[PDB]
Every structure is written in C-alpha cells, then in structure tokens.
Enzyme design. Structure first.
Site, PDB file in Angstrom:
ATOM      1  N   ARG A   1       7.851  -8.151  -1.291  1.00 46.97           N
ATOM      2  CA  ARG A   1       7.008  -7.432  -1.268  1.00 46.97           C
ATOM      3  C   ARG A   1       6.502  -6.662  -2.607  1.00 46.97           C
ATOM      4  O   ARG A   1       7.421  -6.020  -2.959  1.00 46.97           O
ATOM      5  CB  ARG A   1       6.775  -6.714   0.017  1.00 46.97           C
ATOM      6  CG  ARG A   1       5.716  -5.538  -0.139  1.00 46.97           C
ATOM      7  CD  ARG A   1       5.842  -4.498   1.276  1.00 46.97           C
ATOM      8  NE  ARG A   1       4.782  -3.428   1.099  1.00 46.97           N
ATOM      9  CZ  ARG A   1       5.018  -2.358   1.051  1.00 46.97           C
ATOM     10  NH1 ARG A   1       6.243  -1.869   1.421  1.00 46.97           N
ATOM     11  NH2 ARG A   1       4.033  -1.418   1.165  1.00 46.97           N
TER      12      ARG A   1
ATOM     13  N   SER B   1       1.891  -1.964  -4.282  1.00 48.83           N
ATOM     14  CA  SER B   1       1.334  -1.434  -5.542  1.00 48.83           C
ATOM     15  C   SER B   1       1.497  -2.312  -6.921  1.00 48.83           C
ATOM     16  O   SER B   1       0.809  -2.005  -7.727  1.00 48.83           O
ATOM     17  CB  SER B   1       1.111  -0.069  -5.533  1.00 48.83           C
ATOM     18  OG  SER B   1       0.120   0.362  -4.633  1.00 48.83           O
TER      19      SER B   1
ATOM     20  N   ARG C   1      -8.523  -1.421   3.248  1.00 50.99           N
ATOM     21  CA  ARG C   1      -8.830  -0.797   2.290  1.00 50.99           C
ATOM     22  C   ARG C   1     -10.179  -0.660   1.668  1.00 50.99           C
ATOM     23  O   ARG C   1     -10.275   0.275   0.767  1.00 50.99           O
ATOM     24  CB  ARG C   1      -7.818  -1.384   1.122  1.00 50.99           C
ATOM     25  CG  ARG C   1      -6.235  -1.345   1.337  1.00 50.99           C
ATOM     26  CD  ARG C   1      -5.934  -0.012   1.709  1.00 50.99           C
ATOM     27  NE  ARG C   1      -4.416   0.262   1.900  1.00 50.99           N
ATOM     28  CZ  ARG C   1      -3.685   0.931   2.610  1.00 50.99           C
ATOM     29  NH1 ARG C   1      -3.935   1.721   3.489  1.00 50.99           N
ATOM     30  NH2 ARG C   1      -2.314   0.992   2.393  1.00 50.99           N
TER      31      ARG C   1
ATOM     32  N   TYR D   1      -5.434   8.834  -6.984  1.00 55.37           N
ATOM     33  CA  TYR D   1      -4.927   7.294  -6.620  1.00 55.37           C
ATOM     34  C   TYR D   1      -5.618   6.845  -5.481  1.00 55.37           C
ATOM     35  O   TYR D   1      -5.743   7.720  -4.323  1.00 55.37           O
ATOM     36  CB  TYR D   1      -3.533   7.753  -6.570  1.00 55.37           C
ATOM     37  CG  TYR D   1      -2.686   6.418  -6.507  1.00 55.37           C
ATOM     38  CD1 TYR D   1      -2.801   5.265  -7.187  1.00 55.37           C
ATOM     39  CD2 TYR D   1      -1.774   6.224  -5.270  1.00 55.37           C
ATOM     40  CE1 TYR D   1      -2.031   4.098  -7.307  1.00 55.37           C
ATOM     41  CE2 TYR D   1      -1.057   4.962  -5.139  1.00 55.37           C
ATOM     42  CZ  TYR D   1      -1.248   4.096  -6.314  1.00 55.37           C
ATOM     43  OH  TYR D   1      -0.655   2.767  -6.117  1.00 55.37           O
TER      44      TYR D   1
ATOM     45  N   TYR E   1       3.650  -6.056   6.820  1.00 60.50           N
ATOM     46  CA  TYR E   1       3.369  -6.683   5.712  1.00 60.50           C
ATOM     47  C   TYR E   1       4.154  -8.187   5.776  1.00 60.50           C
ATOM     48  O   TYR E   1       3.468  -8.782   4.911  1.00 60.50           O
ATOM     49  CB  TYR E   1       3.266  -5.841   4.308  1.00 60.50           C
ATOM     50  CG  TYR E   1       2.562  -4.520   4.226  1.00 60.50           C
ATOM     51  CD1 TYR E   1       1.157  -4.640   4.485  1.00 60.50           C
ATOM     52  CD2 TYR E   1       3.132  -3.193   4.224  1.00 60.50           C
ATOM     53  CE1 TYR E   1       0.575  -3.477   4.494  1.00 60.50           C
ATOM     54  CE2 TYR E   1       2.608  -2.077   4.319  1.00 60.50           C
ATOM     55  CZ  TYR E   1       1.274  -2.328   4.429  1.00 60.50           C
ATOM     56  OH  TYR E   1       0.460  -1.089   4.299  1.00 60.50           O
TER      57      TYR E   1
ATOM     58  N   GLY F   1       5.667   0.528  -3.887  1.00 56.89           N
ATOM     59  CA  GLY F   1       6.097   1.445  -2.622  1.00 56.89           C
ATOM     60  C   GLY F   1       7.573   1.187  -2.594  1.00 56.89           C
ATOM     61  O   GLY F   1       8.559   2.238  -2.428  1.00 56.89           O
TER      62      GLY F   1
ATOM     63  N   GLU G   1      12.113   1.238   0.977  1.00 56.67           N
ATOM     64  CA  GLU G   1      11.396   2.458   1.197  1.00 56.67           C
ATOM     65  C   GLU G   1      12.169   3.540   1.932  1.00 56.67           C
ATOM     66  O   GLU G   1      13.074   3.325   2.282  1.00 56.67           O
ATOM     67  CB  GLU G   1      10.246   2.183   2.067  1.00 56.67           C
ATOM     68  CG  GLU G   1       9.266   0.982   1.548  1.00 56.67           C
ATOM     69  CD  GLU G   1       7.683   1.307   1.896  1.00 56.67           C
ATOM     70  OE1 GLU G   1       7.489   1.530   3.116  1.00 56.67           O
ATOM     71  OE2 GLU G   1       6.913   1.228   0.854  1.00 56.67           O
TER      72      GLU G   1
ATOM     73  N   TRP H   1       9.250   5.155  -1.180  1.00 61.36           N
ATOM     74  CA  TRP H   1       8.977   5.175  -2.460  1.00 61.36           C
ATOM     75  C   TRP H   1       9.802   6.685  -3.127  1.00 61.36           C
ATOM     76  O   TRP H   1      10.076   7.525  -2.352  1.00 61.36           O
ATOM     77  CB  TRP H   1       7.603   5.452  -2.859  1.00 61.36           C
ATOM     78  CG  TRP H   1       7.052   5.920  -4.292  1.00 61.36           C
ATOM     79  CD1 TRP H   1       6.788   7.075  -4.763  1.00 61.36           C
ATOM     80  CD2 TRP H   1       7.326   5.108  -5.470  1.00 61.36           C
ATOM     81  NE1 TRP H   1       6.625   7.225  -6.103  1.00 61.36           N
ATOM     82  CE2 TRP H   1       6.832   6.005  -6.530  1.00 61.36           C
ATOM     83  CE3 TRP H   1       7.592   3.861  -5.750  1.00 61.36           C
ATOM     84  CZ2 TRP H   1       6.983   5.604  -8.004  1.00 61.36           C
ATOM     85  CZ3 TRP H   1       7.569   3.466  -7.056  1.00 61.36           C
ATOM     86  CH2 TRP H   1       7.403   4.311  -8.000  1.00 61.36           C
TER      87      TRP H   1
HETATM   88  C1  MJA Z   1       3.417   4.207  -8.522  1.00 53.71           C
HETATM   89  C2  MJA Z   1       3.700   4.684  -7.067  1.00 53.71           C
HETATM   90  C3  MJA Z   1       2.596   5.739  -6.607  1.00 53.71           C
HETATM   91  C4  MJA Z   1       2.415   5.922  -5.190  1.00 53.71           C
HETATM   92  C5  MJA Z   1       2.035   6.924  -4.489  1.00 53.71           C
HETATM   93  C6  MJA Z   1       1.733   7.538  -3.231  1.00 53.71           C
HETATM   94  C7  MJA Z   1       2.526   6.634  -2.467  1.00 53.71           C
HETATM   95  C8  MJA Z   1       4.122   7.424  -2.424  1.00 53.71           C
HETATM   96  C9  MJA Z   1       2.864   5.151  -2.650  1.00 53.71           C
HETATM   97  C10 MJA Z   1       3.782   4.428  -1.854  1.00 53.71           C
HETATM   98  C11 MJA Z   1       3.319   4.269  -0.581  1.00 53.71           C
HETATM   99  C12 MJA Z   1       4.105   3.424   0.151  1.00 53.71           C
HETATM  100  O1  MJA Z   1       5.558   3.548   0.305  1.00 53.71           O
HETATM  101  C13 MJA Z   1       3.864   3.494   1.838  1.00 53.71           C
HETATM  102  C14 MJA Z   1       2.623   2.918   2.176  1.00 53.71           C
HETATM  103  O2  MJA Z   1       2.879   1.503   2.156  1.00 53.71           O
HETATM  104  C15 MJA Z   1       2.234   3.415   3.603  1.00 53.71           C
HETATM  105  C16 MJA Z   1       0.829   3.001   3.938  1.00 53.71           C
HETATM  106  O3  MJA Z   1       0.247   1.760   3.290  1.00 53.71           O
HETATM  107  O4  MJA Z   1       0.096   3.583   4.715  1.00 53.71           O
HETATM  108  C17 MJA Z   1       3.343   5.083  -4.396  1.00 53.71           C
HETATM  109  C18 MJA Z   1       3.269   3.567  -4.751  1.00 53.71           C
HETATM  110  O5  MJA Z   1       1.844   3.066  -4.684  1.00 53.71           O
HETATM  111  C19 MJA Z   1       3.566   3.401  -6.085  1.00 53.71           C
END
Ligand code: MJA
Ligand code: MJA
Length: 424
Positions: free
Chosen positions: A85, A88, A185, A200, A270, A378, A400, A402
């Site tokens: 997976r 992001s 989304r 973001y 996912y 993530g 996970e 992150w």
């Molecule tokens: C560059 C990183 C920046 C982020 C900013 C905020 C979050 C912590 C992101 C990760 C969220 C992820 O671990 C959990 C999501 O999948 C939960 C959801 O989708 O509701 C992270 C990831 O997108 C990558």
C-alpha cells in the site's frame, strides 16, 4: 609463512581482524535493521538508494511482509517486489500524470479548474458553525487553479485532519459519502479560499479527476500507459483486487499498539477493497522496486516520464513568502503530524510540485541538501530525491501509524549511512 597452493589469508586472530576492515556506516546501519526485526520492533523494511550514474544501486530487504503466519507456520519475507500500500506516496505519481497532461497541451497549470472540475468550483467553503450549531457555508473567494491543487494551497483539507471537517463528519453530513468502507475524497467542502494557506488535503484526488476528464481515460489506464509502460513496471496499480498474482504476494498492514508498542495485524479496508473510483491522492499499490524506478527516472532526468525541464519545475519553491512562512510555522508547530518524516523537526522548507523542498542543507555536508524533494505515505513510507547530492532514497515500511519513532530513527540511520559513503 603461507600455505602452498592456497590463497594467502588470515591465519591468526590479529591478521584476520586486520584483513577484515572495521565496519563502515552502511554495514553498521544494516545491523540496526536486523536487530529491529529480531527484537520485534518492526515487521520488516525495504531500503533502496540509487544515484544517477549507476555506481550506487543499493537494495536491502529485512524481515517480513506481515505478522500473520502462513500455511507453513512461517512469516513470509518483505521483498523488493512485494505489493505494498503506497497510500500518500501515490501523490507523486498523480503529480507526474498532471504534468504530463500539461506537456501535451491538455491543461495549463494556472488555468482555473472551472472547465474540467465544475463540480469542485461549485463547492462552498465551510466557515465555522452557527450560534445554534447548523453548518455555515459560503461562496469561495477567488478561483482554484491546477497549481493550487499541486501545492496544497486550494483551501481543501482532509476529514481526519481539520477540526471543522471532523465536526462535519460528527454531525453526519458525510455518512453516505463512503463505499465498501472507503470514504470519498471528493464529497467534503473546502475550509479556506485558494491562496490563503498551505493545507494538506484531497487536492491530488481532484487533480486525478482532472486528468481523467482531460484525457478521457480512467486513472488506472492513464497510469499504465504513461508511468508504468515506459519504465517497464508490471505491478503498479489502483486495482489490486483485479490482480490475483499481486494479491497472493501482497504485504499485510501492521499497526503498532498505542498501549505497549506491540505489533499487530491491521485488517485494513484498503487491502480488501479498491473502490470503484481511482483516487489520485492515495490509491496505488506497488512494490518498493517499482516506486524506485519512478524516483530514479526523475533523478536521471532521462525524459521517460517528463522532459528534464518539467522535472526541474517540480523542485522549485512554489510558495510566495507569505505562504512559505505560514507553511513552516504550521509544520514547526505540528511535530504530532510531522509531514517531513525523518527531516529535522524545525527546518526551512517550501513546497514544490509533488512534495516538500528543503530550503537549507539538513546537516551541512553530511545529509540531504538544499533543493531536495520529499514526501511519504501513511505506513511509514519515505521518499526523497536530492539532485545536488546526486542521490535518491526510499525507506519502505508497511507499519502504521505514520511518524513511528522506531521507523523514523531507522530511516535516519539509513539515509545518514548512504550519504556518508556515497553522496557526491
Ligand atoms: C507525508 C505524510 C503526511 C501525513 C499527514 C497527516 C497524516 C498523519 C497522514 C497519514 C494518515 C494515515 O496514516 C491514516 C489515514 O489513512 C486514515 C484515514 O484515511 O482516515 C500522513 C501521510 O499522508 C504522509
Ligand atoms: C489532532 C490531529 C492530529 C492527528 C495526527 C495523526 C492522525 C492522522 C490523527 C487522525 C487519524 C486516526 O486514524 C488516528 C487516531 O486513531 C490517532 C489516535 O487518536 O490515537 C490526527 C487527528 O487526531 C487530528
């Protein structure tokens, strides 16, 4: 003295310790990864580094693709070709796809999204709530452009991240905007005007829809024809559930328990459903190897994905001083989010097209340089491309949440070691 017919070698402890040179940065780093697996701090990892010249082509795989034992009671290995997976880390791919559309004259980066995304243009801005508590919406001031989507300056946020939108879901406005356990989304409204702040959000999901509409192809087909085929990638897809070969070999997600730091199987939505729509911010599965192919192509400026000049644009600071200053204040004040992953927690940054740019050297001559581009996914996936160092690297986990300290520390040691021995 030596033995007749046999290669001269060490024949006592002294000469064997001198024949084997002291452990360099990279060797010592690999020991840390092995120990992290052995002590069950991580399930596994894949780390990869490449230079432009070919002199550096480093891939190491540690541990397992899951914490679930297989039919033979074993934990199967995490490999360079294991389907994972990307979450992001998909955003880089979608960014490249938008830039390809620009190169072919289908779109202009400063064009308003009205023509292709009138459904986005029609969306209101959420601005707090009533004195009673009703949802208070208003009309957007100014136009969203494609460049705003690519730089996360559109006003769009994420439901899990922003307070107003968290309340929106809590009040029940998004209950029917889900499918097979995956939230849309595209449904949620903006939380600011375009240009007002770096936020973001679901920008690349909208940018993906724009690609589909500009090309008349769904994002999966566009991906295969324009990213995968030119690089000889056969295992990168939005549609994992239609690839039984990848499904048989895929990683499971692992989650670290908040309570005791213990690893557990994470039955992630996912991995069981793709969703009907291809979401450009998050939906791709691929192997670490295939992802590196993308990074390496950009580092080489080989023209397979984009013209070298278009790639150069990705690395140019895109924010004006006001947004640059606001982004850094937000990031410096949010170590609980930590968009920059292993990077120093206070650093002068900007945003390019496809990720965060370092506006200063991270540690003088020892690590990533000014001009380096980075982002992540993530499950503790972190990628960066450093044209000045001549290096790009990728630290791939499927764990996970992150910003896991163990993963971040390991990722730092990995990068530091590679830069120490091979930066140029
Ligand atoms: C560059 C990183 C920046 C982020 C900013 C905020 C979050 C912590 C992101 C990760 C969220 C992820 O671990 C959990 C999501 O999948 C939960 C959801 O989708 O509701 C992270 C990831 O997108 C990558
Ligand atoms: C306070 C803000 C910071 C966050 C940091 C990391 C995550 C992305 C949070 C939400 C995602 C969610 O899936 C993770 C939560 O279960 C975290 C927790 O409360 O243990 C987010 C939200 O808590 C909003």
């Amino acid at each position: 003295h030596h033995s007749s017919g046999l290669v001269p070698r060490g024949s006592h402890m002294g000469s064997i310790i001198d024949a084997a040179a002291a452990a360099g940065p990279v060797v010592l780093m690999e020991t840390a990864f092995r120990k992290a697996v052995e002590s069950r701090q991580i399930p596994g990892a894949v780390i990869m580094a490449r230079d432009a010249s070919g002199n550096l082509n480093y891939t190491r795989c540690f541990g397992a693709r899951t914490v679930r034992r297989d039919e033979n009671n074993q934990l199967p290995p995490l490999q360079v070709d294991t389907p994972c997976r990307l979450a992001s880390a998909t955003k880089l791919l979608t960014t490249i796809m938008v830039l390809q559309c620009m190169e072919r004259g289908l779109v202009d980066l400063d064009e308003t999204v009205d023509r292709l995304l009138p459904d986005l243009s029609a969306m209101p801005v959420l601005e707090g709530f009533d004195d009673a508590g009703n949802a208070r919406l208003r009309e957007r001031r100014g136009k969203i452009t494609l460049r705003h989507l690519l730089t996360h300056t559109s006003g769009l946020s994420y439901v899990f991240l922003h307070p107003l939108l968290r309340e929106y879901m809590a009040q029940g406005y998004l209950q029917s905007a889900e499918k097979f356990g995956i939230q849309s989304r595209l449904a949620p409204p903006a939380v600011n005007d375009p240009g007002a702040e770096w936020i973001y959000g679901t920008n690349l999901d909208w940018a993906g829809k724009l690609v589909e509409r500009a090309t008349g192809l769904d994002l999966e087909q566009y991906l295969q024809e324009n990213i995968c085929a030119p690089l000889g990638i056969t295992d990168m897809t939005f549609k994992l559930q239609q690839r039984p070969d990848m499904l048989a070999r895929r990683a499971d997600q692992t989650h670290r328990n908040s309570a005791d730091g213990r690893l557990r199987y994470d039955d992630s939505v996912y991995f069981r459903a793709d969703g009907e729509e291809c979401f450009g911010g998050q939906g791709v599965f691929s192997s670490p190897g295939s992802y590196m192919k993308v990074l390496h192509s950009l580092l080489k400026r080989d023209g397979l994905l984009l013209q070298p000049q278009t790639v150069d644009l990705m690395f140019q600071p895109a924010l004006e001083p006001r947004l640059e200053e606001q982004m850094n204040q937000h990031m410096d004040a949010s170590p609980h989010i930590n968009y920059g992953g292993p990077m120093p927690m206070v650093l002068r940054r900007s945003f390019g097209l496809g990720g965060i740019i370092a506006l200063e050297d991270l540690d003088g001559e020892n690590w990533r340089r000014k001009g380096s581009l980075t982002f992540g996914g993530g499950p503790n996936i972190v990628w960066q491309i450093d044209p000045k160092a001549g290096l790009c690297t990728l630290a791939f986990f499927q764990l996970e949440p992150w910003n896991d300290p163990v993963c971040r520390d390991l990722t730092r040691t990995f990068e530091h070691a590679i830069y120490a021995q091979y930066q140029q």
